[PDB]
Design a protein around this nucleic acid. Structure first.
Lengths: 71, 49, 135
RNA sequence: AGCUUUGCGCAGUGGCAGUAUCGUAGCCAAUGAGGUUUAUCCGAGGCGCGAUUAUUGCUAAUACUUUUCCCAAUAC
């Protein structure tokens, strides 16, 4: 249980990479509706890795037990 | 397991075999003998007289 | 391992080849017990490659058939040879680093077997009885 | 004489989820709980309160100095 709950709340590589931000490399302001929203090294061609990051399956949104039984 | 892998695996399988042996002897200490099963069936099928 | 050397050193026309380092181990031991045994053996061969060669043959028969690479040995003797191999690795580490093998902790031995350990130069400073002085 | 069904215990091997698990000398309930759909029809728990890492226990990680021996004539 502790391992599963730590993996769910753990800082995934894609979420780790959005935390960062390049120094002096100014990003274009995507997402009009809220400026300041910026992905980190996700696609900014900064200092990340060559391949695209993959979504962690443990972060996939799921529904409750009572909600499922009502469904 | 890094230090002595085979010894550790042998210990783990010893624990597994101990659990299985305990389960099997618990099943055996209750298992009804053939004479007991026969007398049980006969007594169940007899008493409607 | 002299089989790999005898193959590669006298080979031409580069070609792919497949091996199996879990010769017959998987019939009796698990996968990551076989991997740990392989790691111990490979660390030993990295350490000496000749003392471990003698250790890999506890007898003079030691039937290492050409069908596979490692000697056909039993698990009970595998425990003993692993103990000797671990002792060899620790003894070499102590000889090279002037440390005491009995003084090594458990995680110290794990780090010795797996990878390597970090040193500490004099430039690394921990700047992070009383004598009164009149000034 | 095997085969097999149901319910209940003791186990063993797994898988799944920690927004849920348990308690109820509190109340109500097949003399009917709850009913959004299928209502001259369905058919059981519900409410309030309480404990909690949203069940509860362990195991482990977070260190060295007590002692106890000593100098001297082949001489007025």
């Amino acid at each position: 249980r502790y391992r599963k709950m730590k993996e769910r709340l753990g800082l995934t590589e894609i979420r780790k990479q959005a935390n960062r931000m390049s120094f002096g490399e100014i990003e274009e302001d995507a997402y009009q509706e809220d400026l300041g929203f910026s992905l980190g090294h996700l696609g900014k061609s900064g200092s990340g890795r060559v391949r695209q990051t993959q979504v962690n399956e443990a972060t996939k949104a799921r529904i409750s037990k009572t909600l499922q039984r009502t469904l | 397991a890094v230090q002595d892998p085979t010894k550790v695996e042998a210990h783990v399988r010893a624990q597994m075999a101990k659990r299985q042996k305990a389960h099997e002897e618990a099943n055996a200490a209750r298992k009804l003998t053939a004479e007991q099963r026969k007398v049980k069936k006969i007594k169940k099928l007899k008493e409607d007289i | 391992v002299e089989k790999f050397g005898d193959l590669i050193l006298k080979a031409t026309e580069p070609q792919m080849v497949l091996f199996n380092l879990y010769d017959d181990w998987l019939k009796t031991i698990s996968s990551y017990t076989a991997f740990s045994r392989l790691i111990l053996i490979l660390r030993a061969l990295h350490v000496n490659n000749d003392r471990a060669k003698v250790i890999l043959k506890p007898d003079k028969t030691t039937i290492t058939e050409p069908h596979h690479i490692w000697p056909t040995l039993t698990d009970e003797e595998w425990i003993k040879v692993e103990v000797q191999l671990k002792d060899l690795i620790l003894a070499d580490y102590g000889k090279k680093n002037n440390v005491n093998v009995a003084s090594l902790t458990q995680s110290e031995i794990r780090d010795i077997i797996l990878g390597m350990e970090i040193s500490a130069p004099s430039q690394q400073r921990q700047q992070i009885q009383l004598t009164a002085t009149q000034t």
